[PDB]
Design a protein around this nucleic acid. Sequence first.
RNA 1: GUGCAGAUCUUGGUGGUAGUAGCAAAUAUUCAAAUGAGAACUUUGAAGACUGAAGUGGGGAAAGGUUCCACGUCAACAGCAGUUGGACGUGGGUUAGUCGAUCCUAAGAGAUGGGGAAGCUCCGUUUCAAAGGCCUGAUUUUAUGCAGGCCACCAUCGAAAGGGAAUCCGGUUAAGAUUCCGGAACCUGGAUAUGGAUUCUUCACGGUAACGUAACUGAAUGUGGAGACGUCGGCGCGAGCCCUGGGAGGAGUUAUCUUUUCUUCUUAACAGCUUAUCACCCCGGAAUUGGUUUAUCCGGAGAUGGGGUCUUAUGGCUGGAAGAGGCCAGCACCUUUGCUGGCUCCGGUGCGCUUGUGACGGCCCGUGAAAAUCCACAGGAAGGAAUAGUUUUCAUGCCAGGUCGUACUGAUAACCGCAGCAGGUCUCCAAGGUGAACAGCCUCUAGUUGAUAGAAUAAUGUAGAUAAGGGAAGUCGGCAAAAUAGAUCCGUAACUUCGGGAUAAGGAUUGGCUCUAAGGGUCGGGUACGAUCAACUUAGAACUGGUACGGACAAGGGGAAUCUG
Lengths: 252, 112, 77, 63, 50
Amino acid sequence: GRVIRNQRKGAGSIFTSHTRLRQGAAKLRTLDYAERHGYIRGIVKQIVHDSGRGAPLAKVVFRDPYKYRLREEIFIANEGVHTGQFIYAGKKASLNVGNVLPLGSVPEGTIVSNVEEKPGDRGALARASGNYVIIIGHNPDENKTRVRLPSGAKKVISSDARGVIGVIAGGGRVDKPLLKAGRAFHKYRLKRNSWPKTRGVAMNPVDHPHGGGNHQHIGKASTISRGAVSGQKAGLIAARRTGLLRGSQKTQ
Amino acid sequence: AQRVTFRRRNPYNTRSNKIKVVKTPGGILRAQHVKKLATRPKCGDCGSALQGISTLRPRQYATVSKTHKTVSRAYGGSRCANCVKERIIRAFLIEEQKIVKKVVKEQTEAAK
Amino acid sequence: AREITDIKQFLELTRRADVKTATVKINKKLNKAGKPFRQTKFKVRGSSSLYTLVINDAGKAKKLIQSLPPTLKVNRL
Amino acid sequence: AHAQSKREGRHSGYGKRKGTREARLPSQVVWIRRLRVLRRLLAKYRDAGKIDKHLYHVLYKES
Amino acid sequence: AAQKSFRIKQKMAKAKKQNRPLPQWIRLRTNNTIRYNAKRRNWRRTKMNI
RNA sequence: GUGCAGAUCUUGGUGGUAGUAGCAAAUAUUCAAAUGAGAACUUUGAAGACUGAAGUGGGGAAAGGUUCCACGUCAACAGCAGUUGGACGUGGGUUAGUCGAUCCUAAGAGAUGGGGAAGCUCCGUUUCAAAGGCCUGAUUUUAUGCAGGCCACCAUCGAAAGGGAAUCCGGUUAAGAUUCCGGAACCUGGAUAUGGAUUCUUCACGGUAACGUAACUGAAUGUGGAGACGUCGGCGCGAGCCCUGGGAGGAGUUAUCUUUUCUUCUUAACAGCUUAUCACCCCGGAAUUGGUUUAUCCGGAGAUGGGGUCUUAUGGCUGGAAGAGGCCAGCACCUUUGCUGGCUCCGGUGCGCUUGUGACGGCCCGUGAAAAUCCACAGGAAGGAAUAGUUUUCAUGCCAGGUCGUACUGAUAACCGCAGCAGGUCUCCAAGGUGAACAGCCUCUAGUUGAUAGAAUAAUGUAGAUAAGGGAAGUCGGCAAAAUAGAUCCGUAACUUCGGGAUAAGGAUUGGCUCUAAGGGUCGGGUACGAUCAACUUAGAACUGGUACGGACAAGGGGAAUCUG
Ligand SMILES: [Mg+2]
Ligand SMILES: [Mg+2]
Ligand SMILES: [Mg+2]
Ligand SMILES: [Mg+2]
Ligand SMILES: [Mg+2]
Ligand SMILES: [Mg+2]
Ligand SMILES: [Mg+2]
Ligand SMILES: [Mg+2]
Ligand SMILES: [Mg+2]
Ligand SMILES: [Mg+2]
Ligand SMILES: [Mg+2]
Ligand SMILES: [Mg+2]
Ligand SMILES: [Mg+2]
Ligand SMILES: [Mg+2]
Ligand SMILES: [Mg+2]
Ligand SMILES: [Mg+2]
Ligand SMILES: [Mg+2]
Ligand SMILES: [Mg+2]
Ligand SMILES: [Mg+2]
Ligand SMILES: [Mg+2]
Ligand SMILES: [Mg+2]
Ligand SMILES: [Mg+2]
Ligand SMILES: [Mg+2]
Ligand SMILES: [Mg+2]
Ligand SMILES: [Mg+2]
Ligand SMILES: [Mg+2]
Ligand SMILES: [Mg+2]
Ligand SMILES: [Mg+2]
Ligand SMILES: [Mg+2]
Ligand SMILES: [Mg+2]
Ligand SMILES: [Mg+2]
Ligand SMILES: [Mg+2]
Ligand SMILES: [Mg+2]
Ligand SMILES: [Mg+2]
Ligand SMILES: [Mg+2]
Ligand SMILES: [Mg+2]
Ligand SMILES: [Mg+2]
Ligand SMILES: [Mg+2]
Ligand SMILES: [Mg+2]
Ligand SMILES: [Mg+2]
Ligand SMILES: [Mg+2]
Ligand SMILES: [Mg+2]
Ligand SMILES: [Mg+2]
Ligand SMILES: [Mg+2]
Ligand SMILES: [Mg+2]
Ligand SMILES: [Mg+2]
Ligand SMILES: [Mg+2]
Ligand SMILES: [Mg+2]
Ligand SMILES: [Mg+2]
Ligand SMILES: [Mg+2]
Ligand SMILES: [Mg+2]
Ligand SMILES: [Mg+2]
Ligand SMILES: [Mg+2]
Ligand SMILES: [Mg+2]
Ligand SMILES: [Mg+2]
Ligand SMILES: [Mg+2]
Ligand SMILES: [Mg+2]
Ligand SMILES: [Mg+2]
Ligand SMILES: [Mg+2]
Ligand SMILES: [Mg+2]
Ligand SMILES: [Mg+2]
Ligand SMILES: [Mg+2]
Ligand SMILES: [Mg+2]
Ligand SMILES: [Mg+2]
Ligand SMILES: [Mg+2]
Ligand SMILES: [Mg+2]
Ligand SMILES: [Mg+2]
Ligand SMILES: [Mg+2]
Ligand SMILES: [Mg+2]
Ligand SMILES: [Mg+2]
Ligand SMILES: [Mg+2]
Ligand SMILES: [Mg+2]
Ligand SMILES: [Mg+2]
Ligand SMILES: [Mg+2]
Ligand SMILES: [Mg+2]
Ligand SMILES: [Mg+2]
Ligand SMILES: [Mg+2]
Ligand SMILES: [Mg+2]
Ligand SMILES: [Mg+2]
Ligand SMILES: [Mg+2]
Ligand SMILES: [Mg+2]
Ligand SMILES: [Mg+2]
Ligand SMILES: [Mg+2]
Ligand SMILES: [Mg+2]
Ligand SMILES: [Mg+2]
Ligand SMILES: [Mg+2]
Ligand SMILES: [Mg+2]
Ligand SMILES: [Mg+2]
Ligand SMILES: [Mg+2]
């Protein structure tokens, strides 16, 4: 039979990201002298819409400490930051929405976005519109910090790892119904070519494990093992449970 | 009732192919191609069209004399007056308060 | 490409360097409302430009015509 | 000749009409004309002082 | 076409030249065999594929 | 490599079929002359029509490649013909500093230090690399070694619709033209000298300000701007087209009628002065809130008002430039072909049409490229005058601008479909009437009049129409056909997610002609009105006809349910 749809995506032909209009990668400043000893000041020169993104970017310019020139950065904008505002980044820096501080330097309950996984990676976690992470504790010996990510997971990372105070802007985007095919259409038009989706059960056997039969139906359990091999994994992969989730979610 | 043709190989209505109709001394109608319109230069501080400055397509600015490219105040062909007004007042008051900031913490060190 | 109203500036041009040829044009035209009169345009060919002075007064014309440098090539009509 | 009789209000009956009243003469066109004429009267009555700016302002919003 | 490369224009020229009837004096040579030009070509019958 | 009747045998040749099927889509032809051996088919004149500016008109892109043009010419070819041709023979023809390529970057493609792979090669593109070159100074052996300081930007290819230095009008050829000729410009590069400006207060003054200008030094470095950007809506304005008054010409009709019908009356790039919605400055200090758009937005973060500043889209006058071009008359004569004249003037109108553009508004989990390149500002390195210096962003002047494409078709015959195939194949310009209209139908300009022909009009057909009484009884089934239809007015059910259902359903009216009424612009009013000019809309009223009138064209059948998405 045929190579199924989820196998063809990895070869990246018609499936690569539609990148032309994007403002450029959002990152924190490089972690340098200023940021790990002192603080350094910047101005948000603009806050701007990035294509295929939920949340606005903020263009933030700084002075180059080692050379006379301006150096401009692209930040994900936290809700409430504004044009003309001064941004402070460094180990010793006041605790205010929009500033970037090492996770060690903020008290528990602090709310931060675009937080680094390792120190220096210029931010990894909690970048999507509406999201943040909460600092749930410190271990000053071995200087770690325990945080809770948007997924509900709780991870422990270096207290040197930087984050930015506040939550990411443009929240509530997903509360509004798309209402029609076209709105979805233009949505994925600026992301990648994932839409619309043919059901495997509407296909012929060559095309898909679910394909075929004189009635539409899966024909065997749609829960597939991790051990499964490419061309086998479609449906519910490695599911530990299945069915309507009753009762409260929200991990203890 | 007299119709007209493009004067160049390019058959299509692209922005570089903009056309105008003109009556000649031959007494007949004829197309003449038209360069895209130039846009007014903008203040770097705010972004209004800055007054006093002539508006040409970028390379034509090299064919014109310097008075068309400036106004007589500092930051002339660059910033918008009222913007320059601000960075004067701001500069001054900040450079002042900078004195106020030093002598106050000069005493704070001495009495504490 | 250029027009001149200064009868002094004009003569200066006619004696300048690069200027070899020239031409004088005569036009019948009407004055104000009722009657006609005789217009004459003095055209001087400069290297990059053709200067033309229009003398509406018939008198200044004849006077101006002889004032022309004798070594200048002039085309009549 | 025909154009003349039309100036005389001829060949205008209901049997001579194919486009709708709107398509023939849009409402908005009619209104914009009117509201501009009213707007234009108030302004000159104020400028001449025939009407005082307070009465004008009222008539403006009522227009 | 109608705005060409020189390369194409060149081939077009060699093509023009090759299009003529057999020069008749050849027919008179000793042991002449060629009767007519057998490679003749026409723009509405065979296309020359660039 | 030895014997054929066969193998739906192989190649070639040939029959009956048969002078048979046929050569019937795209409205359409006709009279005469000329030419010629020969004319239904060529050329010319006439007539009848057509395409009807959403073209059968005028050009291009892909593609073709000489099909373009002239002369000669009919063996084959153009499924009749042929004197004709996109055929045959022989020649001629494509002119650029400004139009394109060329330059830039897009998706993308792809060398290099490298890392894989037995290897053809695969991966990577700034990636674990000692990755390169500008500005001038140091030379007065001299030609370019070293002295600074930068820049670490790290190939290149990739758009004849993206970005982009700069040209127009008239004339001209058998066939070329924004390319030639004539005149008049502009750009870029290289040289430069005179004039002006500037300076003894060295690197200009003026204006309260917005900002003004003929100029008015400015290295490294840095920063800003232009290039540079969606879509729809109404409103404002420009251009060309459309409509139209007076006059000055030429043409048509004139039994009768028409101060009539048709037509000419034009002005390029470029340059000077001038012209703008928006924006901004100065004075002033606002409730009795005011200003104000078609569209409700603005003001103590300074409105309304008065006075000014700016962009120059765009228009006006003048230069170009009447000398050109257009239209007439009056003479000349085998010719090349002239010559002489006159006139080419002044207005009006707009929900018009196309297109351009402005200030606004609507929309988005869509917010609608990049690079070359050009300019500016911050900075102040440095270089500079009184016995004479600085200036080429002001004026004028000198030299130069290479290589390749440039014909023509662009389609019911120049491309692809075996072809001169009823198919397919990207796009610009767009007149008058009727009408809501880029609809249909008729017309002007331009272009066509191509598609074998003649004679008859049996059956059966294809395509177009009509039928008394009945009215789906026909059929698997109302298939096919018929009915309906524009617009104004009246009137409109169940049900419903309250948005709909709805043009529901059901009704009346509609020509011609002659009147009445309502609806606007502009100017002077001391610190009630008058005068003038220019527009089809809407309603109402008489008269009139073989009761007709969305008179052709154009133009929904409706209702009650079931299944189902
Ligand atoms: Mg990608
Ligand atoms: Mg898809
Ligand atoms: Mg699905
Ligand atoms: Mg699906
Ligand atoms: Mg299926
Ligand atoms: Mg399978
Ligand atoms: Mg299975
Ligand atoms: Mg199945
Ligand atoms: Mg199922
Ligand atoms: Mg052309
Ligand atoms: Mg467009
Ligand atoms: Mg100016
Ligand atoms: Mg200026
Ligand atoms: Mg300075
Ligand atoms: Mg309305
Ligand atoms: Mg008015
Ligand atoms: Mg109001
Ligand atoms: Mg072939
Ligand atoms: Mg081949
Ligand atoms: Mg043998
Ligand atoms: Mg044998
Ligand atoms: Mg046998
Ligand atoms: Mg045999
Ligand atoms: Mg046999
Ligand atoms: Mg046998
Ligand atoms: Mg046989
Ligand atoms: Mg026969
Ligand atoms: Mg027959
Ligand atoms: Mg047939
Ligand atoms: Mg015929
Ligand atoms: Mg004929
Ligand atoms: Mg017709
Ligand atoms: Mg039509
Ligand atoms: Mg052509
Ligand atoms: Mg023959
Ligand atoms: Mg043929
Ligand atoms: Mg034949
Ligand atoms: Mg024949
Ligand atoms: Mg030939
Ligand atoms: Mg030839
Ligand atoms: Mg060019
Ligand atoms: Mg080149
Ligand atoms: Mg490679
Ligand atoms: Mg290239
Ligand atoms: Mg290009
Ligand atoms: Mg282009
Ligand atoms: Mg010409
Ligand atoms: Mg020639
Ligand atoms: Mg031609
Ligand atoms: Mg020339
Ligand atoms: Mg010249
Ligand atoms: Mg130069
Ligand atoms: Mg001066
Ligand atoms: Mg820049
Ligand atoms: Mg920019
Ligand atoms: Mg673009
Ligand atoms: Mg030009
Ligand atoms: Mg004012
Ligand atoms: Mg003033
Ligand atoms: Mg002005
Ligand atoms: Mg209106
Ligand atoms: Mg926008
Ligand atoms: Mg500029
Ligand atoms: Mg100069
Ligand atoms: Mg060179
Ligand atoms: Mg041509
Ligand atoms: Mg043809
Ligand atoms: Mg072909
Ligand atoms: Mg065809
Ligand atoms: Mg006309
Ligand atoms: Mg036929
Ligand atoms: Mg026929
Ligand atoms: Mg027949
Ligand atoms: Mg019959
Ligand atoms: Mg009948
Ligand atoms: Mg019957
Ligand atoms: Mg009945
Ligand atoms: Mg019945
Ligand atoms: Mg029966
Ligand atoms: Mg029955
Ligand atoms: Mg049935
Ligand atoms: Mg029925
Ligand atoms: Mg039917
Ligand atoms: Mg009937
Ligand atoms: Mg119903
Ligand atoms: Mg009536
Ligand atoms: Mg009236
Ligand atoms: Mg049923
Ligand atoms: Mg459906």
